[PDB]
Design a binder for these strands. Structure first.
Lengths: 412, 71, 71, 414, 69, 69
DNA sequence: GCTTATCCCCTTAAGGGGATATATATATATATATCCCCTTAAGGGGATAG
DNA sequence: GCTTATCCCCTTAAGGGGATATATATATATATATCCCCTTAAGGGGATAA
């Protein structure tokens, strides 16, 4: 039977999965019916009945983790039929990253819309010590989603939303890695999510907050917020995040982010993060670490950046000298598009800046700002670290960053 | 309603004036003496379209446009 | 606010829009990424301005456009 | 859009995909009109019109490696357009298990019909590392693997619409190549038909290799050629999904019953059974639908091709979690109690009923059962001494030790 | 022409034939003297199909069978 | 081996062989896993036997058929 | 010195003329696939005789 | 001793009748994406008459 699709309790349009593969969508008349109607994913705009496009599948496919090693447990723990977007989205096809829900046409059920399991320590830990040997969690490697409720975390319930994302220890120690990346990341003006680490017994983990899920004024409801990734923008499958595969980089993103609500401020925060990555050493910034907001009528603004991790924590002292480091995505250059840390000097961003006719002054400013504020940032993060944060990663990353930042004051 | 931000964000609402208003490109332009091409093209590529044309298709749709606030 | 019916008014409007704020044609094309020879030319001859150039011209002034029933 | 499938320089037909994404098919008259004609699988036999059943989609699905592990790697490494079957193929139409060639209608061109490039003694350890973590190859199965060409002592690479010859598997469990080799040689020692496998070395990678019976060098030696073949599940036209029986696939029963159509009916069966009794004394828990293929001959003929992917699950035994008690035969057995599959407790008595239920001459089973009542004590040392010193000498003391435990059921009888 | 070793094969083939000639699965059952249903039961699952049946079908197809060594 | 047409013609023909080959019914149905009687009846009154058996025989007969124009 | 309209050079091409390869929707007919019925009978066990 | 024809016991389904549901085909209006031809020119560099 066909699968349905609501958008936080609204009828959008049930999809028509077919044997042969010719998947055909549709538009739950009551969604197109509302003036604040907003398509599922830009890729799949707003129109009538059947949709003869392919981005279709694509979309319903990206509802699963890019890491392929993760797509296979649903046919096991809940005994699905296959691992296709149809059989992999039946059992846990309820809470979808963003706000869209999926369930067949035979189960208009409403379990306790809200209910939390006040977990203990041994418990909290428990659930996690099993993630190694009805929610969706995938953005980098291996991570689960919980529900931060006050001071104690608690297992969700029914079609109840998640407030966080618990990233498990994957990069010999990612937890302290991404945590740092953030406090210091937001420190330079970058609009990112305030996360906090998680500790239970003897295990360690990462805890990020959401940004497509928020408490209304009175703290009664917690609506997931409409969102999507740059991939499900032009109908792409997870295999295209980077550019070695054919995904959106620092060229396409730009032409597109132009039609945004905050067309202006967004383009800015962008370039910014870009050089941000460079310095800090993040190199895992693929097409899927970018997210807009599926606002009514079809508008889109850049959400707070996420999944940041620099390769600095591990370099040279193992088997991959500094020379080996290439920015997640590619930026214009003279000899094609360079993507070398040490090769990418300020002059570069400038050129790659005028390539799109992005306000030069603005660029100059950014490079400037970071340059100057950078010094303090590091310290302010170092003097604000846990009483045990591994000084290794600390000094390791910290040092390199300064070496990179060096390619600034000497030019601006 | 909704605030328009790009040439595309607009071409999207224009595809509502047909499927909802019955009319089709085969006629919308029959009334304003223009080529269905611009229409079809416009629908998927609203960037290359020029304003004077945009309006012939804008009025011929019993619709008018105006400015507002980008807040 | 008002109803826009022609390519002339369409822009005639935006024009008054950056004057009442103290902005020059050559200082808005900047913060956005096009020229002054465009913003201007646009003003006196906005008939054949591509929509992009259209909306963009908007970005500058922090505007937003939308239709309206032609009743 | 219209991936045209071919079979050894023969315009078989066109595989069209509708707007909605349908997976239909239509045979070219040219192929019809020949005395030779044969469907890719009996799942989709010859006929004069667009097809529509699920098989049209199934058969194509088994083509491309089953593992999504790889699939993602596909679109990824090759600029695909969807995780859909038709798509992954739309681009990697070169090499495909079975006489399959997928190339659009914009390449009737005489692309490289014969060309390759020998590998260095280092690249032999490099190309692997490349698979695990124009390379136009695709192998369907269990873990990380691909095929390659072999010429004398070299190891070239298929370039252009040119096929391969050997198979190259990789370690998974702690070892895989070491298990794959061990089980295969004893096959030729028990009258079973298996391919010629070796252990080509390349730097620090103990790799595996296999001879694809689907590939055969014609006399002239001037042109290598593939052979239209499929495995049971395919025959009918089912998705990888229902591989194993407990999940709704074909069993010993459906099988046998379909072996009767073989052009070589009694043999295929004889051997099939024999193999079922073998997969018992060794612990081949993996015996599913996608390991038992059949050749495809003109007019609809077919037989039971050699058995591949054979492997035993004895490595993780004894001093490990999973014990022989929990081990279960891939295919179900007929016992007095519903069906029995628990290898450990499976005495001939059961097999005897089986043969009885499928109405297979009891005597024919006996000859098979009895054959393994005295050949092991010898057949073993015969292959036990045909292995180098480097090979892991802990894959023999584990399997054999247990293969002689269940062998008691055969020795205390015949 | 083509050797055969099974139920299905038979049908799969006689089917092609019918298709080649371009007749109607109906005019067969009539032209000869049987139901049109069987005409279909046979072309899809001729397994426990009547022996004589076969001929009737065969005979219509302006065809014959032969034994090959 | 000629142009066939009747059930009974195939029956007579087969025995012509099974016997002249030295083989017989008793053993025939012993191998292809059927009943003695089966081959027996089928032999003399093949007008009602089915095609699923027509083949089981062709196996324990190293023989088979095909269509012919 | 700052704001604004032409113009030169140049690449891309929207858009009108004129015209064609994909689309929902539809009716005579065609149509290979199914259903309850009904019943004569085949292979299945097991087994003796003209 | 042996190959071969019957024979009861016994489950099921094939074939007939009649009838019907699900395809599937050559039709037939009416409809979004295109294609080569060709003409005023708009939006980028760069520059400056006013």
């Amino acid at each position: 039977p066909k699968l349905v699709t609501w958008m936080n309790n609204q009828r959008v349009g049930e999809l028509t999965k077919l044997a042969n593969g010719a998947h055909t969508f549709k538009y739950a008349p009551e969604w197109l019916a509302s003036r604040y109607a907003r398509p599922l994913s830009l890729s799949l705009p707003l129109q009538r009945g059947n949709i003869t496009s392919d981005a279709v599948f694509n979309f319903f496919d990206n509802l699963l983790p890019d890491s392929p090693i993760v797509r296979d447990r649903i046919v096991k723990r809940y005994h699905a039929k296959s691992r296709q977007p149809f059989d992999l989205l039946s059992e846990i096809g309820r809470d979808s990253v963003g706000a869209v829900t999926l369930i067949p046409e035979d189960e208009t059920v409403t379990h306790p819309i809200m209910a939390w399991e006040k977990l203990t320590e041994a418990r909290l830990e428990e659930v996690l010590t099993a993630y190694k040997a009805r929610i969706s969690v995938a953005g980098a490697q291996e991570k689960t989603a919980l529900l931060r409720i006050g001071n104690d975390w608690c297992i969700p319930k029914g079609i109840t939303p998640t407030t966080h994302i618990i990233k498990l220890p994957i990069l010999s120690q990612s937890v302290d890695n991404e945590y740092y990346c953030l406090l210091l990341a937001k420190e330079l003006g970058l609009n990112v999510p305030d996360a906090e680490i998680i500790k239970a017994g003897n295990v360690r983990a990462l805890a990020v907050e959401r940004f497509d899920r928020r408490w209304n004024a009175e703290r009664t409801v917690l609506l997931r917020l409409p969102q999507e990734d740059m991939c499900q923008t032009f109908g792409l499958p997870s295999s295209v995040k980077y550019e070695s595969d054919g995904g959106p980089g620092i060229a396409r993103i730009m032409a597109f982010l132009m039609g945004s609500s905050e067309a202006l401020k967004d383009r800015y925060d962008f370039m910014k993060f870009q050089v941000f990555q460079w310095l800090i050493g993040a190199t895992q910034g693929h097409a899927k670490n970018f997210s807009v907001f599926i606002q009514a009528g079809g508008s889109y603004r850049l959400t707070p950046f996420y999944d940041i991790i620099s390769a600095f924590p591990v370099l040279g002292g193992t088997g991959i000298h500094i020379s080996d480091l290439k920015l997640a995505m590619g930026l214009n250059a003279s000899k094609g598009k360079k993507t070398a840390i040490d090769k990418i000097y300020p002059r570069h961003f400038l050129a790659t800046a005028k390539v799109l006719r992005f306000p030069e002054v603005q660029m100059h400013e950014i490079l400037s700002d970071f340059a100057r504020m950078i010094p303090a940032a590091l310290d302010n993060v170092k003097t604000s670290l846990p009483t045990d944060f591994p000084e290794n990663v600390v000094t390791a990353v910290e040092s390199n960053v300064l070496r990179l930042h060096g390619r600034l004051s000497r030019e601006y | 309603f909704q605030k328009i931000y790009s040439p595309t964000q607009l071409a999207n609402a224009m595809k509502l004036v047909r499927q909802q208003n019955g009319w089709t490109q085969s006629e919308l332009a029959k009334k304003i003496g223009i080529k269905q091409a611009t229409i079809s093209n416009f629908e998927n590529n609203p960037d290359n379209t020029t304003l004077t044309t945009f309006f012939k298709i804008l009025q011929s749709l019993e619709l008018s446009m105006t400015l507002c606030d980008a807040k």
